[PDB]
Structure 1
Amino acid sequence: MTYFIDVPTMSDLVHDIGVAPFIGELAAALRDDFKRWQAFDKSARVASHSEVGVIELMPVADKSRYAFKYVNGHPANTARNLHTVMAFGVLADVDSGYPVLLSELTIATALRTAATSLMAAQALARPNARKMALIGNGAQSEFQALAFHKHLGIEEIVAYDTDPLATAKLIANLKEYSGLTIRRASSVAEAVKGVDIITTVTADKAYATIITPDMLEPGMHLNAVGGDCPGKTELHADVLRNARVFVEYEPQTRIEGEIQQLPADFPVVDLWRVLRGETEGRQSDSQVTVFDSVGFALEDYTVLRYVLQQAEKRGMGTKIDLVPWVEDDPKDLFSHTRGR
């Protein structure tokens, strides 16, 4: 009983639920899981670096369920008509090790990342937010835009991308949402002027200063999503020093996040503690808050469980023979060598 949800099936699932509800429901599910932070067997994801990218495995588990996601990060892929980010994952039973679900996670990753950013913003950004800058208008952009528009009251988005066609795509994809205005800016500095939230989702395997100190205004919240690997950043180190920085899983973020540019003792705040109301999140209206996001296995665990439950209710997905199921003699593996 290993169920498989491929790309087109996930497409039908997301279409059925709706992108907005999917993100909203997922953010709520993520919030609850983050509150249960200490119940999970956590670890920094394993990364295998190459010349133009990275391939990583992201495991996590509690006492009953195990989950992991395979994911790559190759910014140069788009030049070859491939996605910068591709992923898939598995949800398994802890007491038997049996893989219950194998699922595409490329579409799901964009959804969980948007939901995670939304969850963090709901807890860290000023409640009156209405304008957001969206730097990087690629694969993640539409999801981030909708998450903030439908669930955080963002009515206006000022977008910028080195690739003008990417911005055109973003505007065209969301035009159907009349309550949301999205306009193209000629530069990052122009896009971020006067915004309440800055979301960065650029893809470039190198140290970059997308956001510089001069762009910061009192009360801003920075949703820094693009940088997510050692040697891959989007914020100038001083931007972090002028803000209260929040992270997912500190041990991993110290190596892959924006904070990799600062001393190992630079103070950061664990988001799960804020969500439990045990540690202060935003401390004032003038403060600048930064969500140093790199992605963490727990978020994939949440979306995998969500997808399994939602697909089950809709009778979606197909069964595959990935590993042996129950057998008369589980010690007779050799019998399988005689052919099906």
Structure 2
Amino acid sequence: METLILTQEEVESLISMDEAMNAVEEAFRLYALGKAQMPPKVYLEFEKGDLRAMPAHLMGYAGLKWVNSHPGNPDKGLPTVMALMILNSPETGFPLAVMDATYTTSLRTGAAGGIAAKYLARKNSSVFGFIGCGTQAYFQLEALRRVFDIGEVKAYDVREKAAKKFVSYCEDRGISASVQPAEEASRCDVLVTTTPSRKPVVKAEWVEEGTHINAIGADGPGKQELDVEILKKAKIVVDDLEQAKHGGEINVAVSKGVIGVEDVHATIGEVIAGLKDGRESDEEITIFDSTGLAIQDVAVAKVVYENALSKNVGSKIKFFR
């Protein structure tokens, strides 16, 4: 036995949005039903950044992703976020593969958006808003368009060029799109928030009846994108209650004591497994609060891995004797 090693380039070509969506969907469901293992994240704090260990066990695979976040890195010429994933057999413990997880992380968060919209947005959804046109908004779009003939896109960003670049990308693939300011962008069927805002970027009365919001942006205590007033009158669905309470979109309203646990309707897993209701009336406004769960990562890695075996990809390394 040897260990497979796969680089970012290799992984990219080894998994499609479609595969990723299935992996993620099934991962949420299995976890909701008690058929997946995900112990708490572990942190190592530094002055200039941090590292997290996120292990999980499901679908006959175990793995650990080890991912950093160092904001100063761009200015140093490296990416803000680098992730490696070690994938293991639960039978032997053997390290089947060590692979990049930078790409897959982005991929599965988008996948997750797609799935959540799949279960929570109105089926007749045609107009799509993007508040923030960074890397994740692309993934969110790519996944969402696996589930919707997206009729119009409305794109807002703080940086003029970033918005435009996003719009050009849409028009490249036939989606009619338009740069718009945040006011009008927020008015749609599906809204996708990806900003790392600390004040709310979206106002309550901009959100119409029947809107679904993928609140992906917020990634830590104090980050917030939506007016606490939308959360007050919405069907709220989480990635994971603890992690949403700490770092997700609800974190500030929870801390200020404006909504509590009581107010969260369901985990997405629960919705997929049918333990809790999805969307009810057309008029209601729904929010998916995304956080990232390690099970998403392992589930997507088993897909990459198994394909790599199929297509004979990677370097093989013999770690032991």
User: Could you tell me how far apart the structure 1 residues matched to 2:59 and 2:29 are?
Assistant: 16
2:191 maps to what in 1?
198
Which one-letter code corresponds to 1:9 in the other structure? E
2:178 maps to what in 1?
183
Which one-letter code corresponds to 2:4 in the other structure? Y
Which one-letter code corresponds to 1:135 in the other structure? I
2:132 maps to what in 1?
136
User: Could you tell me how far apart the structure 1 residues matched to 2:116 and 2:105 are?
Assistant: 16
Shift of 1:253: 1.9
Shift of 1:52: 6.0
Aligned CA RMSD, in angstroms, stands at 2.1
Alignment of 1:118-267 (within 5 A): 118-178=114-174, 180-185=175-180, 187-193=181-187, 195-204=188-197, 207-261=198-252, 262=254, 263=257, 264-267=260-263
Q: 1:48 to 1:243 in 2, by over 3 A?
A: farther
Q: 1:240 to 1:58 in 2, by over 3 A?
A: same
2:297 maps to what in 1?
300
Which one-letter code corresponds to 2:209 in the other structure? P
Q: 1:127 to 1:74 in 2, by over 3 A?
A: farther
Q: 1:166 to 1:35 in 2, by over 3 A?
A: same
Task: Say whether the 8 Å CA contact 2:111–2:143 is kept in structure 1.
Answer: yes
Alignment of 1:278-289 (within 5 A): 278-289=275-286
Q: 1:231 to 1:290 in 2, by over 3 A?
A: same
Shift of 1:80: 5.2
1:35 maps to what in 2?
29
Q: 1:35 to 1:265 in 2, by over 3 A?
A: closer
Aligned length: 312
Taking structure 2 as the reference length, the TM-score comes to 0.89
Task: Say whether the 8 Å CA contact 1:211–1:239 is kept in structure 2.
Answer: no
User: Could you tell me how far apart the structure 2 residues matched to 1:32 and 1:250 are?
Assistant: 18
Shift of 1:196: 0.4
Shift of 1:173: 3.4
Q: Residue 26 of structure 1: SS of its match in structure 2? A: helix
Taking structure 1 as the reference length, the TM-score comes to 0.85
Percent identity of equivalent pairs: 30
Q: Residue 134 of structure 1: SS of its match in structure 2? A: strand
User: Could you tell me how far apart the structure 2 residues matched to 1:161 and 1:35 are?
Assistant: 34
Task: Say whether the 8 Å CA contact 1:24–1:151 is kept in structure 2.
Answer: no
Query: More deviation in 261-270 or 109-118?
Result: 261-270
Shift of 1:308: 0.7
User: Could you tell me how far apart the structure 2 residues matched to 1:27 and 1:277 are?
Assistant: 18
Task: Say whether the 8 Å CA contact 1:74–1:85 is kept in structure 2.
Answer: yes
For 2:64, which of 65, 68, 71 is the aligned residue?
Answer: 68
Query: More deviation in 275-284 or 58-67?
Result: 58-67
2:271 maps to what in 1?
274
Q: 1:170 to 1:258 in 2, by over 3 A?
A: same
Gaps of 5+ in 1: 15-21, 328-340
Q: Bigger radius of gyration, 1 or 2?
A: 1
